[PDB]
Every structure is written in structure tokens, then in C-alpha cells.
Subunit: 325 residues, 4 copies
């Protein structure tokens, strides 16, 4: 009859009370076990019988690469059984830009992996966690929802981890993607799909971390009007593997940045040019240094280069990774 699904908790807002009926102020978030959540929404049972686990309880601001490593692995572990049809994961709102994209490059299965969260506290007037969680499961248990990549579900929308991001600081509808749109929507208890991702992911993925201990170090440097050359000397003097330049316009550099990058490359450090605008593609130009991010954002570019460096260190191949993913 009903399918079996597992909820993996990491903290967040959906599982976090405030101190007032309408308190949307800096409070302590992520203070809820996976046991209670079952309670609050007993309507979940009509959808599918569920089992819960506790993977952690830390703010998304402090989510770390170490955890993503432990998470991806576990995920593959449970997705491999016959009594596990899908997986839902509660997570923070501040870094939901990175976490769901990392598993997109490392889970080896067709069975659904869905992230869910909330902008309003669980005690706020008109809290969204309930209904966002309710629909996050529904898509998990759906047959048609298979083989579409890692998904993100908030505000009645269904979007891919390759495109979505938090576009506004504190609004309910922050997550979106101007250019790419959504995958599908959830209306009237029914689900409607509209489009499919046209990039490589999950199964066809070449990245595997079945047995990796630590990832390389990758920094992000902003580009502005009077940017400091010395900001570069640091990461270098700390031996990081790669650097992601979040630059002006389509990743342009000043005579101070054009200089620092070279200094870095010589030392064997890989650099990638991304934009600071928030949308669009950065094209290539032999008149400038470094490699070029496709239409990946600073945040997601770091997540790519980090895994692209455990495989190889050859520019050509790397560059070709940014256009295929």
C-alpha cells in the first residue's frame, strides 16, 4: 500500500520555536527533535508511513563540509535498501544554496531526495513549516517524481538544486531562479510537473566520495571598485587548493586583481571567474586570467571546484566540468 519514507533532521527553522506569536527576530533556531515533528502534522500518515533519524542540530550558518560528507554517504546507504522509497531532509535557510547541490553530485540513485525548510519560526503567527513539510513528503512518495535530480521544496514550488537560491533576505518567497524557472508546483493536493533539468547529475555523475576523508580548501574573494591585492596574499600564504573570484560584471578584474590571480596560478592554485550579479553566464576571454564559471554562482562554484579537485588538477578537464554540470 503506502510507501516507506525517512526524514533526516539537521535543525532549521521549521523545527525551531521563538518566544512570541509574531517574533521574527534573531532567536535560537534549530531546537527541535525529529520525534515531535511527527506529532504536529498527523495528516502526514495519510501520505505515507514514516521513520525518523537525527543527523544533527546546528545552525545552517555553521553547516560544514565535514557534515556534508557524512550526509551524502548515509543517504546512499539507506537509498540502497528495499524498504526505503524516498528521503526528506530538514535544513537551514541561510546555506540552502550549497547543501542540496552537493548531494546532487554524489547520490547514486533514482530514488527521490528532497530538501525542505521554513522562513518563519514554528511559533510565529502563520508559520509555514507545517504546510511546507506536508508537501515536501507528498512529492517524495510520488512515482513520477523519480529521476529528476535533487529537489528543493518551499512555498508550494518544486525547483532543482542546480538553479534555485535565496534571492531575498527575509521574505517567504525568496527562493527562485529568474532565468531557469521551476520544475513543478503543488496545488489542490495534486502535483503538476512542467520541466526537466538538462545537465548531468546523480546517476551519470562521475563524482564519488565513497571513501574520502577530507576535501581541499577553497576561498571566495569579492570584486569591487578599489579591491586589495593583499587579500590574495593570505589564502596563498595558507595553501588553499582553489579560489573563486566573485567579480564585477561578467567576472572582470582590476589591475590589482589581474595581478593577484597570476601570482596565485603560478603557485599551482586553481582560480575560477564567477559573477557578483546573481544571474547570467560568464563567457571566456583570452585577454584575462583564470578559468570561467558557466552560469554557476560564487557559492555553488566553490562546491564544484572542491570536488573537481579530488579528481584532477588539469585546467582543460576542469573547465569542461563547469559547462557540462
Amino acid at each position: 500500500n503506502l510507501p516507506n519514507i525517512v526524514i533526516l533532521a539537521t535543525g532549521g527553522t521549521i523545527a525551531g520555536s521563538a518566544a512570541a506569536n509574531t517574533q521574527t527576530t534573531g532567536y535560537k533556531a534549530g531546537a527541535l527533535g525529529v520525534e515531535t515533528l511527527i506529532q504536529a502534522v498527523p495528516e502526514l500518515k495519510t501520505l505515507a508511513n514514516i521513520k525518523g533519524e537525527q543527523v544533527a542540530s546546528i545552525g545552517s550558518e555553521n553547516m560544514t563540509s565535514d557534515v556534508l560528507l557524512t550526509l551524502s554517504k548515509r543517504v546512499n546507504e539507506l537509498l540502497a535498501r528495499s524498504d526505503v522509497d524516498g528521503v526528506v531532509i530538514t535544513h537551514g535557510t541561510d546555506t540552502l544554496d550549497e547543501s542540496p547541490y552537493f548531494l546532487n553530485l554524489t547520490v547514486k540513485s533514482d530514488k527521490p531526495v528532497v530538501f525542505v525548510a521554513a522562513m518563519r519560526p514554528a511559533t510565529a503567527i502563520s508559520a509555514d513549516g507545517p504546510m511546507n513539510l506536508y508537501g515536501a513528503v507528498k512529492v517524495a512518495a510520488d512515482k513520477n517524481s523519480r529521476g529528476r535530480g535533487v529537489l528543493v521544496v518551499l512555498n508550494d514550488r518544486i525547483g532543482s538544486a542546480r538553479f534555485i537560491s535565496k534571492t531575498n533576505a527575509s521574505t517567504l518567497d525568496t527562493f527562485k531562479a529568474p532565468e531557469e524557472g521551476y520544475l513543478g508546483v503543488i496545488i489542490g493536493d495534486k502535483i503538476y510537473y512542467q520541466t526537466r533539468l538538462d545537465k548531468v547529475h546523480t546517476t551519470r555523475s562521475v563524482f564519488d566520495v565513497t571513501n574520502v576523508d577530507k576535501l581541499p580548501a577553497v576561498d571566495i574573494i569579492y570584486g569591487y571598485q578599489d579591491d586589495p591585492e593583499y587579500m590574495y596574499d593570505a589564502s596563498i600564504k595558507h595553501g588553499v587548493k582553489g579560489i573563486v573570484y566573485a567579480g564585477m560584471g561578467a567576472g572582470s578584474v582590476s589591475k590589482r586583481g589581474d595581478a593577484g590571480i597570476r601570482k596565485a596560478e603560478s603557485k599551482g592554485i586553481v582560480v575560477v571567474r564567477s559573477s557578483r550579479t546573481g544571474s547570467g553566464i560568464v563567457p571566456p576571454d583570452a585577454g584575462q586570467p583564470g578559468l570561467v564559471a558557466d552560469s554557476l554562482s560564487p557559492a555553488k562554484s566553490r562546491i564544484l571546484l572542491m570536488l573537481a579537485l579530488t579528481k584532477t588538477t588539469n585546467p582543460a578537464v576542469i573547465q569542461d566540468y563547469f559547462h557540462a554540470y
Copy 2:
């Protein structure tokens, strides 16, 4: 008799030749002087009396603050003359997020000041520089554009320096303000205003740069998963007078981020928290260090802090501007 407008040049995309026709990726900017641009469109003389003089002729991504001053002083002295009705400045698009906001805070006259740029080489198949210029001048020569704050014209749109920025990396409809919209639009050789900036500016700005000669130093640090903290130590060790932070949401800070921000504040450095999303408001929170930017972007916030520091240091008074400007 027709109006008196002057067009101060700086050269950018609008005045930069390409190697071929369809080539709109590899080129040189600040290669074509004012004069020629004036020639390319003989229809401009139907709108006003044009006068032009070069000042920079350099790519947008390499402009420093010591040059901005020169510009503000230059435009004020031209606006005080009983025989000048408006100004029109050309600039690149890369750092067109900063420049406009600077004059909008230092120019002391209700007479019109219009910035203008292009997204393709003047040699592209359907170059926009032409129509955008005629369109900028039309606005400046209007008698109703007076007292509206610094203006930026592109793609037939009229926008406010305080809100407008480059959202996309390559498209030509890149400049927009999702939550704020535009002040006016130009359709059919006709102008239509619809809203007015509701913040402090120009004629009523408490800042006056007319007698200084060197602005303070201000850096910008990014916020992401696993972020380092030696970045902060770098700026402290070089004498920065203030730091802008690009939070992960409502400006959240990580464990290491919390740490860095304090070392700086403990040494006389003022730090303002902005946001890496793109649009939105960072709210006050006594559970974190530094000040909060209203809804200004990391880029724009840095410009407002430079000036702030040339008149004070009382953190309390600094917070108030961000809310009013």
C-alpha cells in the same frame, strides 16, 4: 533658443570598438573619444545645445575613489553657472552600482544629473549605445526631471541610483530593482514618471565633499560555508577604517565570522552587516556584532560608509544614516 547641456565622458562599453561585427565578447573600452560619439548621432542637436569634454577614458572596472572626488567637484562647479541646465555622464557598466550613488550623495543642485552606459560594442550588430544616449539627453533636457536624485538610463528605463543595480551578467535588460521598480519609462519619444524616491538625497544631503582630498579605506568580506577568519586579520593589519560583510541571509555570521568581526570592533574599526542575496532587508539583532545595513547592497553600503567616516565615528549616529539615506 534651446537648453544648455554638457556631457562629461569616461568611456566604457558605449565607446569601445570591437574586432568584428558579431563579436561582442572581445574588445577594448575607452578607445573612442567624446567627439565621435557626438557625431554618430546628429539627431541629438534637436534636443539641446551639446558640449563635451573628456575626463577619464578608462575601463569601468579600474576606477578608483580619488577619481570620483575629481568628478563631484567638477560637476558642482558646472551646475552653479547660470548658463547650464543639465549634465550627462558616460560610464562603464561594471561598477555602475557604486559611482551613481556617490554623486547622489555629494552633488548640491536640483538640476538634472544623468548617467549612461551600453552593453555591446559600438560595433555590435544592434548596438544600444546610440538610442540610449539620445534617450539620456532627452531626460536631462526635460524640465520635470528636476529634483529627483541622480538618474541612470538604459533600455528605455529611468531608474534611481539608490535602488538600481546590474542583476544579470550579460543580458541587456540587466539593470532592475525587483522590489523597488523604476521611476519612469520612455515610450514613443515621450517621458512618463510614476513614482518618486522616498529617501534623503542631494539638495538635502549632510555630506559635502567639496573640501576633502582623500577618503578612508573600506574593505568587503564574503560569507559562506567553511569561511576563513584570517581574512579579517588581513584588513586589520593594513589599517582599514571599516568593513562591510555580506551575510548569508539576514546577514547571519558563522562561528569564525563572529570572531573576526569582534577583533575589528575592538580596535576602532566600524563594521556594517549587509547581505549576499540580492534584494531585501537585514533586521536589527542584539545577538550579533556590528551594525545593520538597511536594504543597501554590499557595494552601495561601502560607498555610504566611506563618507560617513569623513564626518564622524559615533557608531550610534552611523546607524541612523543607513536608515535615512
Copy 3:
């Protein structure tokens, strides 16, 4: 000390209950009365001294000019009082395009008049009503909200009754103004104002229905590829005094439409040309019949023609109200 405001209810998708709590669709609108709505949110009592009046109890789509005319009268002479600082109104979203704009033209006061609603049933898992209603009272209770026009608060945003509209059939963030933005934003128990409408309204309006009891009948015709010309005949043979056209391009006409308009005009009746695209300007064009709606949508345009015809019949004058209002 504590301000005091009055609440006027007229049913709507915010007063509807449903068989279950997971029923987004399929509910009876206009089930509860103002009484209940206040009892649900005990926080309101901490913002002001509330009071209500169940003027009607229906659903958005059955609203009628009769009801409108009444509603405007009852608010005028209640804002005239000294014991009333502001008034909030509850309404469906199915026609919130038309109700706010009507009052925006007929209310004679600088005091706050706020419209509010919700997209999902009061019985639903995360009904948006409670918080929407909390904010509506909040903006009415403020004093810096004076002389701004008729406001409409929904989903934490403050939009002007002249630019806002339902842009999506079922989403919970359906009200927005692509080219004009929002006036302010409610965040962290604070309201932030950014812009001001720049067209005539309220106190400076020349339309006063105080001594009127019947408005002219106006229809709306759509423009598509094989549009028939007999629809105009049918409207002409019913008395109507004016038709709003919902043209294809920027008011483009068909052969069947040219013949159409041309026919009714001679029959002494005014026709305005609007567009079906949902935003933008409709330029003059002496080579095409009828007048031109500035940037008013078919519905906003119909509201402006009824009122327009109570004070005149001159084509020329009506053609100026469309550029100023």
C-alpha cells in the same frame, strides 16, 4: 494614547471554512463574520482599539457597483469623525484589482485606508489570514502612512492601489507590480517605506459620488486572432455608455475591430484602448480609433470610465484623466 481603528468586512476567501484542514481548494467563501476574525488573533488588541461592521458576506466575484458606491460613502463619513484614525477592509482577491482603485479616486481624507485578504482558507494548515490581518491593522495604526493613497497589504508587502494586481491564479504571492514595485515592506515588527505614488488621488480628486445613486454601464471586449465584430453590435444594442478594449499588442486593432469601434463611436459613446499583456504603455496613434489607456489595465480602466462619465462626455477631457490618474 492607543490609536483606534474600525474594520469593515465583505466576506472573501479569508472568511471561508473547509471540510478539512488540507483543503486548499473547494471551500465556502463568506462563512465567518468579522466577530470571529478578531477573536482568532489576540495580538491585535495590543496595537489598537478595534471595532467591526459586517457590511456584507459574499465572495469577491459577486461584488457589484451597488455595493461599491455604498462602501465608499460609509468610509468617507467615518474618517470625517474624530474618534476614527483609520479603517481596514477585508475583501476577496478575485477582484481586488477593482475595489481599491475605486476608493482611491473617491475618498476625501489623508487618513489610512487599508485593504486585506488571503489566498488559502481560514481552516487550512497555514492560513495566511492571521498574519495578513495583523499587518493590515499595523499600517493603519501608523501615522507615517498618511497621504499616500489607498493601500493594499498582503504577504508582508505594501502595494499601491493603482499598480497592484493578481498576476497568478493560485500562488500565495500573486500580487505584484513588475515595473513599479511596492511602496514599503513589513519586516521584524517594523514597516519600511521606500517610494511614493506620483499621480492624482484621494484628497485632490475631482470625483465625488456622495450625491449619486447610479453609474453608467461599461463592458469589456477581448482582442484575439479571429475576433468577431458582432460582439460590439450586441453591446451597442443594450445601451452601454462606453467600452474598454482589451487589445492584442499595444492596443492593436483588427479589421473586425476597426469596423467595430468606428461603429459605436458614431453612435455617441466613448471607447478606450487597453492591452491584454498586463503591463506597459499604450501610445497615441491618430491612425487608430478610440482613445488610449495610459498604463491602466482593462479593469482599472473600466473603473476610471464609469466615474469619468458622471462628470463629462467630452472625449478630449476624458483623455487627460487617463494620463494623470
Copy 4:
């Protein structure tokens, strides 16, 4: 060994002319021919072997279904050959909502079929036609464009026909798909794809007009506050085969509208309910009459209904096409 591409001209705004270089509101359309438009863009020779063929010289305002059925076949006939690789179609802009979706249901192949237009006259400053046509032939000639469905190309974008629509009325960047997005983009002489349509089309379609001479008439009725019922009889009394209801809210009908509907559904015709909002889905509702569009606009809903009326007449059958195309 570049491909062979044919250009079927229909005239449109991309072939329009005027007097002064600044004219962009009063001009004749289609005035130019396929011959001269190519003479204007030599760089095309670089991409493929081209031919031109005139089929009409009117504007999008006057496109009747007669022509469409004619065009629909000449394309199929022209694509079944081997000396034909890709074909481009020059159109106006007023009804580019319709035409593309018509062919998307009737062409039986996998070869590219792209539409292209321009919002400015050819005589205009910074005219957008040339760069547009260049990018249009560009995609057709490419081989990774097969099996992706009919494509619309303007202002550097490649969007789908089941989603694209004219958003703004006069802007140069009008064509958008708020919730769906673009399939690909064109930056620096290189194509970038990212999204795939997820619905039945071209080949898999179950529609063929190869043996059709005349199509069934379908009219659209708008939805507003005080709507007339005498509007439904006008059609019923004229032999309409179908009616699309552009309903307020999510297809919401008014008391008067409810009567006119049943009144017709009983006589014999078929009726579908869409939205006047511009986007979103209309859910199923037993409490209301008629069929429900999926998330198709009134414009597109008609074409579909009209083509489905050449096959079956069973209500339940048709409701199933709206969910699938």
C-alpha cells in the same frame, strides 16, 4: 558543409518602415521583403545556405486561422525533404502567443522550427531586428536543437512555445515566462541550453490538419465585476463550437456568468475555464460548470480547443488533452 535553411516570411513589425530615424510609433508594417532583410545581414552567409519565401505581408493583428492551416502544411511538406535542415519564420508580435503553439501541435518531425520578430521598426535607431535574425538562423543551423519543440527567439533568448508570452506592451525585453523560464540563451556567439519541455508535442502529438479545409470557430469571453449575460447568447445565437472563459481569479464565474455557461453547455457546445491573471493553474471544481484549462492562457486555450474539436466531442476526452499538452 553548412546546412540549408529556408525563411518563410509573413511580414510583421520586423519589416516595417517610417520617416525619421527616431520613428517607433507610426509606421507601415510588412512593407519590406525577405529579399532586402537578408541584404542587410551579410554575416548570415557565414552560417548556412539560405533561401527566402514570402507567404504574406500583413501584421500580427490580422492573422486569421485560414493562413495558419496553410502555413502548417507548407512547413511539413518542406521538412520531409533532405535538402532542408532547418526553417525560420518571421512574424509580427501582437499574436506571437498563438501561431507558435499551433505549429507545435501540427508539425510532424524533429527538425528545428523557430519564430523571430522585432519590437522596433527597421528604420529605427539601435534597431533590434538584425541581431535577432542572426541568432535565429544560428539556432536552426545547429544540430543540438532537434526534438526540443517549436522555439521562439528574441533579445538573446530561446523560449518554448507552450510557455512564452508577450509580457509588456512596448518594452524591448517583453517576452517572458515568470514561472517557467527560458530553455536557453545566446552569449558571445555560442548557444547554451539548460531546460527541456516536459509535455507531448510535434511527433508524439495526436493532431493532423493535413486533410482539413476549415477549422471550428471558438470565441473568448472576459471576466469582470458587473459582467453581461447577453454576451453569451450573442455567441450561442451564432453557432459557436466552443467558448474559453478568461475568468477572474482562478476561473471564478459570477452568478450571471454561471447562467450563460450552463445555458450553453446544455445547448451543445464545449466550454473551458482559464485565468485572466496571466499565469498559474486553474484547479478542478465540481461546484462550478465547464471544463478547466490546465495553466494555458485564454489565447493558447482556444487554439487547443479548436484543434481538439476536429477529433472528438466528448467532454471527458478533451479535459485530458489540456492536462497533457
